[PDB]
Amino acid sequence: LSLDPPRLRSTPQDELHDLLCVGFGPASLAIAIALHDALDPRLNKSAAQPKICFLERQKQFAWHSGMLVPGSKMQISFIKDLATLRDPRSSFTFLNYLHQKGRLIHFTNLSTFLPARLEFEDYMRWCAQQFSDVVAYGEEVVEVIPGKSDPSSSVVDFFTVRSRNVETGEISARRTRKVVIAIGGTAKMPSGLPQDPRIIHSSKYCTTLPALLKDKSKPYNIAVLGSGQSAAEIFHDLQKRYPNSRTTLIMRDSAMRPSDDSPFVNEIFNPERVDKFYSQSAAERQRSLLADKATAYSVVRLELIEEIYNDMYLQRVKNPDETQWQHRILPERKITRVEHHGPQSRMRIHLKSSKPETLEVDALMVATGYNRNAHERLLSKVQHLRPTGQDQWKPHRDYRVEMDPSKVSSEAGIWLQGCNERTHGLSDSLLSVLAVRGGEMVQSIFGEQLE
Amino acid sequence: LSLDPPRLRSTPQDELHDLLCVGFGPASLAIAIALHDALDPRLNKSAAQPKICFLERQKQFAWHSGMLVPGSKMQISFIKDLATLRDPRSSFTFLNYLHQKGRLIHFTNLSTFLPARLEFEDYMRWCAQQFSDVVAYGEEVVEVIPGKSDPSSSVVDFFTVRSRNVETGEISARRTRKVVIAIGGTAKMPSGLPQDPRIIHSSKYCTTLPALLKDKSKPYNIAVLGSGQSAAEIFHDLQKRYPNSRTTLIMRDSAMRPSDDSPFVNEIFNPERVDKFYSQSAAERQRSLLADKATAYSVVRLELIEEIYNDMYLQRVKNPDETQWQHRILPERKITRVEHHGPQSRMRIHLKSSKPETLEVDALMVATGYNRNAHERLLSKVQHLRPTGQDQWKPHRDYRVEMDPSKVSSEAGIWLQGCNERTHGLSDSLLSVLAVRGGEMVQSIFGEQLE
Amino acid sequence: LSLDPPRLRSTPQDELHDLLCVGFGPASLAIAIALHDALDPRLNKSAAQPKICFLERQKQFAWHSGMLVPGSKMQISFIKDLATLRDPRSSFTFLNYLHQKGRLIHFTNLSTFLPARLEFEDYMRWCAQQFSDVVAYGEEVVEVIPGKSDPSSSVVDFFTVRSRNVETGEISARRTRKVVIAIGGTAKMPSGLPQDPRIIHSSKYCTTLPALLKDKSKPYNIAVLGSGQSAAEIFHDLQKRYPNSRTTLIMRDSAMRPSDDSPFVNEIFNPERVDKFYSQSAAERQRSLLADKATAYSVVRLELIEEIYNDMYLQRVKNPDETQWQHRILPERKITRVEHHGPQSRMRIHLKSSKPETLEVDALMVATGYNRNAHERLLSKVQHLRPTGQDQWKPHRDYRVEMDPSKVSSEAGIWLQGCNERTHGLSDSLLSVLAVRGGEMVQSIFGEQLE
Amino acid sequence: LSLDPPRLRSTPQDELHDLLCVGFGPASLAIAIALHDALDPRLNKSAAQPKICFLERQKQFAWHSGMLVPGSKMQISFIKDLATLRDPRSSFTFLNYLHQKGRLIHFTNLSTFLPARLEFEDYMRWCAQQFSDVVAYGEEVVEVIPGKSDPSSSVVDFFTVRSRNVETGEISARRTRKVVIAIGGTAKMPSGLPQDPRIIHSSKYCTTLPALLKDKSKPYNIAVLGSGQSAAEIFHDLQKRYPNSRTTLIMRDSAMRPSDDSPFVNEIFNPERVDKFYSQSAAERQRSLLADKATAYSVVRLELIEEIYNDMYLQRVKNPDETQWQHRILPERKITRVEHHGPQSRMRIHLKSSKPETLEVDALMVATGYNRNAHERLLSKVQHLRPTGQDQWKPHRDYRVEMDPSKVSSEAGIWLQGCNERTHGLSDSLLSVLAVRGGEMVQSIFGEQLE
Ligand SMILES: Cc1cc2nc3c(=O)[nH]c(=O)nc-3n(C[C@H](O)[C@H](O)[C@H](O)COP(=O)(O)OP(=O)(O)OC[C@H]3O[C@@H](n4cnc5c(N)ncnc54)[C@H](O)[C@@H]3O)c2cc1C
Ligand SMILES: Cc1cc2nc3c(=O)[nH]c(=O)nc-3n(C[C@H](O)[C@H](O)[C@H](O)COP(=O)(O)OP(=O)(O)OC[C@H]3O[C@@H](n4cnc5c(N)ncnc54)[C@H](O)[C@@H]3O)c2cc1C
Ligand SMILES: Cc1cc2nc3c(=O)[nH]c(=O)nc-3n(C[C@H](O)[C@H](O)[C@H](O)COP(=O)(O)OP(=O)(O)OC[C@H]3O[C@@H](n4cnc5c(N)ncnc54)[C@H](O)[C@@H]3O)c2cc1C
Ligand SMILES: Cc1cc2nc3c(=O)[nH]c(=O)nc-3n(C[C@H](O)[C@H](O)[C@H](O)COP(=O)(O)OP(=O)(O)OC[C@H]3O[C@@H](n4cnc5c(N)ncnc54)[C@H](O)[C@@H]3O)c2cc1C
Ligand SMILES: NCCC[C@H](N)C(=O)O
Ligand SMILES: NCCC[C@H](N)C(=O)O
Ligand SMILES: NCCC[C@H](N)C(=O)O
């Protein structure tokens, strides 16, 4: 329909970069997009291109591909794509992507605000490919190291970012004034579960479970631990994927509970509300996160809850005896022990009540969420630049971490993205404010240059 | 279509009754209905009629008539009427009521499980009228007094129930072996608000607000305190009822939140789950009530939340300046003081944040819920019959309160209904289990007689 | 929960029956149920049992088992079950069935008026089994023959009904004063299609297609002709059932169109509207059937249309080239020729526009509806009893066919059920008015006896 | 948020224009917008401005303001605004309008594709105001007259457009090579109804009914003739607007029927389908319009049908006697005579069945649709330029009417918009394809200039 906008120019890796971004998921992608738009005279009247590079450990752009369950839907309006809430005229809107694919009229006839996760990933992939010249894939960042252009001074004014090539194992280094860490989360596992190849986090569902359970027709016993959106999607999907299997949903809560996207509550995810949340005290922020927990954690989309309920009711129609059901839910349970050294294909899972019985399974899917602390390890050698006494990174409103002013130049800095819920609200790890935040980040990072 | 079933026979008030029920709301009505069905040879094979009387302070049957807001809907499936979950063959089902009115086919074409509150009240009224011979209306019960058929013994074996005729003020007494107290709740007011005729509880909305604000066209300022279903219904309704008024919703929470009727959670209201809840410890029961709070308290029907949100959005369309809106919501506020002695028509309401500004209004609707402690006052003179040391009534699973066995005959007793959430679960004060509980109560109370 | 009501007594087959019913599908079942209720003193105050028998060719009760597609839903509110609109107190209501199965509370939490076809069939099966003593299964009726108790007179006053035992092939005869023919429809095939085992009517989908296509993993090509509810259900289901197959929906219309159950239109299915429809002239009845055609024929449930549309859109997401899609719709087409004598597994289907290209397929499902003329063949030897000149059976309002009064006794007669759309409206072949019609039929047939 | 794009320059009215557009409703507005975008180097790489003027008879931009009923909703996805389907990057998209108003995030939380008609009008108004320099309001075009730059030749190469200033009555003339007529429809009245100020077309509902019925509290009798979307909206609205009135919906059909926007059917409104429709024969086009009639004419939005049905059911709850209802529907009726010369405030409306009774009313709203023939009158003096024998204007695919090539220069022409259903399909008079058609029109009209 139209031509794609001009590509960003790559930078030789031996040159000092203006910005180096760790990760090229949605959060980094939104920053690339906002930078493109900011450098677009059509979009910004005022609009040399900044020297920028993105390091991504995956071999190409992918969005949670381990959980790309068939049928899985976005839990957010497509209007909250990577550009529209910042500038609906952007070439990087979902609607413009659809138009470019010749699909916009057909999507309109769906009357849905919620694309398949598959389609939304391809949207983001389609955006991502327009930045290929400035993204280095298959590069896993392993550390950020402070640098001094004047080694005999006591002022840091750049950082060296070292990454391991995931194919060759070789170590590269790139130097930059500013670093963004946007690396999402790491799998959270209950500390009571032993390491076993049959015990698999939800994040590796689509990738590593079919490797373990190769025959989709075989009568497997498969359990799912958890009662959030991932637990539900996996529990529901196993029933299609392995149709002769016996599945068990194990949860410490009494029920799957619906996610709250009711319109007054949902305004906590508005981009303008980040100022409001950020400015509250630590205590009020903690109470606020708790009060709105049903919008984000340990909750399932009502539609999916209802579909699973109907499936269970259909089992009840066929057999009033719940102990005989092919697919069962076991609420208010916790796993107290996992026998997993026996000769059998199966582990023995021992269960008790979760208030203050055994299953034998071929695999246990563990849908217990994510931690967002992995940036700490990347930043270990830059900790000493923090103000005296700090043992945590303190991100400012504009997401730049606080550093000792007498140790670090004002031209140099490190920003965090996607790990700042404590300071910036429940929207921080989601897609909800990426469009606007990208804009804010470009302004924060490239502000002098673009003025 | 069919004839109504045989009426129950009245009892002369000077005779010793088998059962005397205080209140003829839904809970008592469900007991009348279950008794009728139990005495129906068509419904119960095994089926002299028990001597029974109901005392109701209203002049005729009415169901929360002060909150019969136009458009107001049931928040419960009609299948949970006063008989169906006990016996769908009962003549007292909602569907059979519709058939009797010649309306069943038209209701079917609505495709709704949720009747207007108006229609459901008329259903219950239609049931209630079939018990007119055994209900004494306009009788307000004021005390229950222990009696001894042998005054020189130390055993109580009946109770005298005294009521005040609401029209004549005259005091009547009726004697009975067994008493049921089913009197619902009393208005809960925040203790910080002064008594004023302009400050009116939600329960008296339809009755006493139009008496105060007589001219529906006048530009009143009207506030609503609270963020539950009643606050919402009243806030929304005032906008139709007084179209030129300026309304303000004052709430200490940050948002109206949706009621949870998602299907797995909603099973806590199943009749069979009362056994389960009752048998849990006090501590587990407390934690359970807390965990499922969003099913019952401080929550609004999503549909109503969404309609109010749309109304506010339409105001935003007309004027981006929220300070100028005719109808406004003020979240995270508490009332710190109410000036109400000035010469003006209006009170001055002083507001502060509810985290750890003034309105001038013609009336303040206070939608802050109910207490369920009024039975305590009726039972003051029977307290001494409790086991030594008890300062609260302890209802058994079958809702009969515990009494000292050496002080009270096994043929005599007092049952509580609708005030037992602490011991019987969130369904206790609702319509949810009335059909089944009525059956259980008839069995508990009339069990010997019906065997 | 309760006990089942008393069984009806069987009749020795050599005795003259009061009523003999051909078929024990829903329509006959509704008559059995209404008769039971009419003989129930609990339900009818006024209430020797009539001598009745039902002849059904299937070996046991089954409801369209060839189209019991997984997930398939009722297209009618459960309130229009086989008794409720006549008498909601009946033991044969859907809700009472649920209660008897201990499932009523769980069904309530579905919040649906539309059961799975599987569940509704089991409801009807559960009803049907209560009449086992008076139903002879595996009996295919082949003719109805006039009888004269006085052979030398010219008055017919009974009929002999002869049936072929489907297992033994043996012929039985039973004599009766009154006959009901309630045998539903026969498969309508386009006259241009040749007989071939690979060409299968929708009615035999679940039974005879898996016999033909034994391996569910094989890449079959399967076509579906038609664009009604059956075509849609089969088209959608093949995609799950044979996941590697290539399916093609062939339709002469341009689109699947949604069924109209909007509430004002839907009142044509009200039981009371049959009087209104019946009394209109032939011309007005014809125009009326045409005007409301979108309620009944060549239409699909919006929900199913939307799901199929989403599946096609998902194919579009993966591949913009519709010619490469696994599952395709070909609108405005007609089949002009079917090569089916070649050596290949597959038939060659030749297509042209349907306005005034070839597929090779392993099977063609033909979803082109039903005829309702099979009663004509059963009644061939009784035609001469019609009034002079009639070449069609003329059913009165009460569904008794017109006969020459001087040739047939007033105590003898034949009623038609389910084939009377022309005279009684679009509800005649559906479940919509079975409850009320059953009552009317019992009154019409057994009226003298029950007075 | 961003600045508005550059304004188009006005043209002195004594200059020969490139394009003169009659009407500035949605269709003309979409052409203005597409022209702006085509001249935008940001949107079109290749991008002297054409000399253009729009003549609109209203004093300012308004969209069907006589039917801007409170609550009225768009019946089309906002994605089908005036630019998005052509170019989602356009500054004239609905989403960009929302962003400019600071409302985009709040609209997102509505989760609706269907704005209030009020909001969508303000969207279009907001677009329209950006073309104020080239629109002359209060100008009613009365004729288009052929011109010859060489009067002694036989070739027309311009047209003079004459308009009457609606305030001063003065006549202006403007000359142009090309003319677009985009003037929408004129009120269709049944020819059997007499002229009376109490008989008012739906198009003048919000403007001229409250002038007639000044007191909203008065017990008026008001009838509505028709059963389409307008009849329904007016019938429903009168009940709020005049709460003590008795309203009557008079319709020749038996029921309000729902509009078909089911997704396969709805593809007839796709912009790409205009090529397909246009190329079909006259006969096939006629049959096609008939087949899809339920998408466009004599149909009501299911949601509105359902709301009206619920209102009627609520009347039934209060009173089983339909003859006493405040608001009544009278189906299958036609008006045979209107007494309207009597002394009373009210007309007497005589009714009969519509198959092949009197009301006395204060006003009759006539909701019987529109004609689209008014361009004929404007073009009367240019008819002779058509090819010999034509008595109708024949619009080409690109909407330019056919003219004799030897009588009219190739640089001169007349285009029709919004009146071409017969040749271009059911989307022609709607908003459905305005975005794309605007683009096509700009290309058709300004094609040489923009190359
Ligand atoms: C199954 C699932 C469904 C979800 N659905 C939604 C939804 O519908 N709507 C919504 O708003 N949110 C949703 N989320 C939330 C999700 O967090 C955000 O949508 C989004 O993924 C966050 O973007 P991100 O860039 O911050 O993190 P990520 O998406 O995790 O991307 C971070 C990137 O950094 C790479 N990376 C990590 N470490 C390194 C390293 N050391 N070196 C180099 N590269 C590295 C990773 O490969 C990854 O690509 C969902 C999450 C999950 C798990
Ligand atoms: C606005 C509102 C809407 C509601 N909607 C629902 C719903 O949709 N679904 C649901 O399940 N629940 C609903 N509820 C909950 C409600 O508590 C129950 O539906 C029902 O009213 C409880 O019945 P009850 O008999 O226990 O109490 P009540 O309904 O309050 O009846 C008690 C009766 O006792 C009488 N009484 C009180 N004191 C005396 C006395 N001293 N002497 C004599 N008579 C006395 C009273 O006049 C009253 O009639 C709603 C409550 C409110 C306030
Ligand atoms: C797939 C499908 C789905 C449908 N879904 C609905 C719905 O959701 N709601 C609705 O209202 N309607 C629905 N219908 C319409 C259907 O016609 C009625 O629901 C119902 O089946 C009609 O009952 P019936 O007894 O008249 O005919 P049938 O159901 O066809 O029963 C007639 C019986 O007579 C037996 N029989 C036939 N010939 C003989 C013979 N010579 N001798 C002895 N026995 C014989 C047959 O075995 C059969 O059991 C559906 C139809 C189909 C095909
Ligand atoms: C109540 C109502 C609701 C509708 N809702 C929708 C909807 O939700 N979605 C949809 O797709 N369609 C809808 N429509 C269809 C409607 O036709 C189109 O939306 C749109 O109005 C068509 O634009 P138009 O410019 O062709 O005609 P119009 O909107 O009628 O505009 C034509 C303009 O020309 C002016 N004009 C007329 N004659 C002259 C003259 N001689 N000289 C100068 N100016 C003149 C008129 O003042 C008018 O402004 C609706 C129609 C009505 C009546
Ligand atoms: N899990 C995603 C939550 C997104 C949030 N409801 C929003 O509207 O932004
Ligand atoms: N507020 C009424 C709650 C009723 C409960 N959801 C139930 O289904 O019983
Ligand atoms: N009445 C408006 C019809 C619009 C059409 N359904 C469309 O989607 O374009």
DSSP string, C384-447: GGS-TT--S--B-TTSBBP--TTTB-TT-EEEE-S--HHHH-TTTTSSTTHHHHHHHHHHHHHT
Q: Which residues pair with D53 in a beta bridge?
A: D20
Tokens 């203005």 identify what position? D32
- Bridge-based pairing of strands D347-353 and D358-361 is antiparallel
Q: Which residues pair with B416 in a beta bridge?
A: B181
With beta carbons less than 8 A apart as the criterion, state whether D168 and D7 touch.
no
Q: Tell me the count of B-C CB pairs closer than 8 A.
A: 81
Quote the CA–CA distance of A277 and A293 in Å, as a whole number: 15
With beta carbons less than 8 A apart as the criterion, state whether A412 and A178 touch.
yes
With beta carbons less than 8 A apart as the criterion, state whether D220 and D242 touch.
yes
DSSP assignments along D308-362, one per residue: HHHHHHHHHHH-S-GGG-SEEEE-SEEEEEEE--SSSSSEEEEEEES---EEEES
Question: Which of D93, D100, D115, D99 lies closest to B310, judged by CA?
Answer: D115
Q: Which residues of D touch C303 (CB under 8 A)?
A: none
Handedness of CA B88, B92, B97, B99 (dihedral sign): positive
What is the dihedral angle through the alpha carbons of A80, A86, A88, A94, rounded to the nearest 10 degrees?
-40
With beta carbons less than 8 A apart as the criterion, state whether C90 and B42 touch.
no
For testing contact with chain D, the best of A92, A105, A265, A432 (most D CBs within 10 A): A105
With beta carbons less than 8 A apart as the criterion, state whether C88 and C52 touch.
no
Q: Which residues pair with B128 in a beta bridge?
A: none
With beta carbons less than 8 A apart as the criterion, state whether D404 and D387 touch.
yes
The token pair that represents C212 in the structure block: 């033909």
Burial (CB count within 10 angstroms: exposed 0-12, middle 13-18, buried 19+), residue A37: buried
Long-range contact list for A166-172, CB < 8 A, 24+ apart?
A166/A57, A166/A59, A166/A138, A166/A139, A166/A140, A167/A59, A167/A138, A171/A142, A172/A13, A172/A139
3-state secondary structure of C275: helix
With beta carbons less than 8 A apart as the criterion, state whether A15 and A139 touch.
no
- Bridge-based pairing of strands D199-201 and D363-366 is parallel
CA nearest to C307 within chain D: D263
3-state secondary structure of B436: helix
Contacting D residues, span 317-336, partner chain B, CB-CB under 8 Å: 317, 320
Quote the CA–CA distance of D34 and D39 in Å, as a whole number: 9
With beta carbons less than 8 A apart as the criterion, state whether C91 and C4 touch.
yes
CB-side neighbour CA atoms (13 Å) of B223: 25
For a substitution probing ligand 4, which of D57, D94, D371, D436 has the most ligand atoms within 8 Å of its CB? D57
Quote the CA–CA distance of D21 and D141 in Å, as a whole number: 10
CB contact (8 A) between residue A103 and residue C310: no
Torsions phi, psi of A355, nearest 5?
A: -70, 145
Whole-Å CA distances, D243 to C399, D215, D219, D246, D418: 47, 11, 8, 9, 37
Question: Which of D131, D161, D170 lies closest to D18, judged by CA?
Answer: D161
With beta carbons less than 8 A apart as the criterion, state whether D160 and D398 touch.
no
Q: Which of D263, D288, D306 sits opposite C263 (nearest CB)?
A: D306
Q: Tell me the count of A-D CB pairs closer than 8 A.
A: 81
Q: Which residues of A touch B302 (CB under 8 A)?
A: 262
Query: In sequence order, which residues have a C-beta less than 8 Å from that of residue A90 and are 6 or more positions away?
Result: A33, A37, A43, A83, A84, A96, D89
| Closest approach of A167 to chain C, Cα-based (Å) | 29
How many beta carbons lie within 10 A of that of residue C211, not counting itself?
A: 10
Tokens 């429903």 identify what position? D236
Buried b (16+ CB within 10 A) or exposed e, A56-77: bbbeebbbbebbbbeebbbbbb
Tell me, yes or no, if C217 comes closer than 8 A to chain B by beta carbon: no
The distance of Cα C361 from the centroid of its chain, to the nearest Å, equals 29
Which ligand has the nearest atom to the CA of B57?
2
| Closest approach of C77 to chain B, Cα-based (Å) | 7
DSSP assignments along D236-286, one per residue: HHHHHHSTT-EEEEE-SSSS--B----TTGGGGGSTTHHHHHHHS-HHHHH
Q: After which residues does chain A have a break in its backbone, defined as C to next N over 2.5 Å?
A: 47, 356
Tell me, yes or no, if B309 comes closer than 8 A to chain C by beta carbon: no
Q: What angle do CA A166, A169, A175 make, to 5 degrees?
A: 85
Quote the CA–CA distance of C132 and D83 in Å, as a whole number: 68
How many beta carbons lie within 10 A of that of residue C129, not counting itself?
A: 12
The token pair that represents A356 in the structure block: 């203050």
DSSP assignments along A219-233, one per residue: --EEEEE--SHHHHH
DSSP structural state of residue C331: -
- Bridge-based pairing of strands D17-22 and D171-181 is parallel
Instruction: State whether the beta carbon of D73 lies less than 6 angstroms from ligand 7.
Output: no
Q: Ligand 7 center to residue D269 CA distance, Å?
A: 7
Ligand 3 atom closest to C75 (CA): 8
Ligand 7 atom closest to A108 (CA): 8
The token pair that represents A58 in the structure block: 């995956």
How many beta carbons lie within 10 A of that of residue B423, not counting itself?
A: 19
DSSP assignments along A377-435, one per residue: HHTGGGGGGS-TT--S--B-TTSBBP--TTTB-TT-EEEE-S--HHHH-TTTTSSTTHH
Whole-Å CA distances, A314 to A231, A325, D268: 20, 10, 39
For helices D117-128 and D94-101, what crossing angle results, to 10°? 90
Question: Which of D120, D86, C325 lies closest to A105, judged by CA?
Answer: D86
The token pair that represents D218 in the structure block: 């008065």
Resolution of this deposited model, Å:
2.1
Buried b (16+ CB within 10 A) or exposed e, C366-403: bbbbbebeebeebbeebeebbeeeeeebebeeebbbbb
Q: Ligand 1 center to residue A390 CA distance, Å?
A: 28
Buried b (16+ CB within 10 A) or exposed e, D163-194: bbeeeeeeeeebbbbbbbbbbbeeebbeeebe
Quote the CA–CA distance of B442 and D249 in Å, as a whole number: 51
Quote the CA–CA distance of C358 and B118 in Å, as a whole number: 62
For a substitution probing ligand 3, which of C142, C268, C366, C429 has the most ligand atoms within 8 Å of its CB? C429
Torsions phi, psi of D266, nearest 5?
A: -65, -10
CB contact (8 A) between residue D309 and residue C254: no
Quote the CA–CA distance of A158 and A147 in Å, as a whole number: 5
With beta carbons less than 8 A apart as the criterion, state whether C386 and C392 touch.
no
With beta carbons less than 8 A apart as the criterion, state whether A135 and A12 touch.
no
Tell me, yes or no, if B46 comes closer than 8 A to chain C by beta carbon: no
In A134-228, alpha helices (H): 205-212
CA nearest to A42 within chain D: D42
Enumerate domains of chain A plus CATH numbers.
1-451 (3.50.50.60)
Q: What are the start-end ranges of the E strands in D23-170?
A: 52-55, 135-136, 139-147, 158-165
Q: Please give the biggest Cα pair distance in chain D.
A: 80
Torsions phi, psi of B144, nearest 5?
A: -120, 125
Atom 6 of ligand 6 has which residue's CA nearest to it? B261
Start-to-end C-alpha separation, chain C: 33
Query: In sequence order, which residues have a C-beta less than 8 Å from that of residue A327 and are 6 or more positions away?
Result: A235, A239, A246, A247, A248, A311, A312, A315
Whole-Å CA distances, C250 to C190, C224, C328: 13, 6, 9
| Closest approach of C82 to chain B, Cα-based (Å) | 14
List all residues whose CB is within 6 A of at least one atom of ligand 4: D 22-23, 25-28, 55-58, 64, 67, 74-76, 140-141, 182-184, 230, 418, 429-432
With beta carbons less than 8 A apart as the criterion, state whether A211 and A200 touch.
no
Tokens 């029927």 identify what position? D257
Torsions phi, psi of A167, nearest 5?
A: -90, -50
- Bridge-based pairing of strands B358-361 and B347-353 is antiparallel
Contacting C residues, span 280-299, partner chain D, CB-CB under 8 Å: 283-284, 288, 291-292, 294
Q: Please give the biggest Cα pair distance in chain A.
A: 80
Quote the CA–CA distance of D390 and D358 in Å, as a whole number: 47
Torsions phi, psi of A73, nearest 5?
A: -115, 150
The token pair that represents B364 in the structure block: 């303040």
For testing contact with chain D, the best of B217, B313, B316, B321 (most D CBs within 10 A): B313
3-state secondary structure of B339: strand
Quote the CA–CA distance of D200 and D361 in Å, as a whole number: 12
Q: Which of C119, C309, C310 sits opposite A317 (nearest CB)?
A: C119
Q: D touches which chains (3+ CB pairs under 8 A)?
A: A, B, C
3-state secondary structure of D198: coil
Query: In sequence order, which residues have a C-beta less than 8 Å from that of residue B65 and are 6 or more positions away?
Result: B121, B206, B207
Atom 38 of ligand 2 has which residue's CA nearest to it? B183
CB contact (8 A) between residue A317 and residue C102: no
Torsions phi, psi of B99, nearest 5?
A: -60, -50
Atom 14 of ligand 3 has which residue's CA nearest to it? C430
Q: After which residues does chain C have a break in its backbone, defined as C to next N over 2.5 Å?
A: 47, 356
Q: Which of A260, A309, A355 sits opposite B257 (nearest CB)?
A: A260
Side chain identity, residue A422: R
In B135-255, alpha helices (H): 205-212, 229-241
For a substitution probing ligand 2, which of B21, B53, B55, B64 has the most ligand atoms within 8 Å of its CB? B64
Q: C touches which chains (3+ CB pairs under 8 A)?
A: A, B, D
For a substitution probing ligand 6, which of B84, B274, B432 has the most ligand atoms within 8 Å of its CB? B432
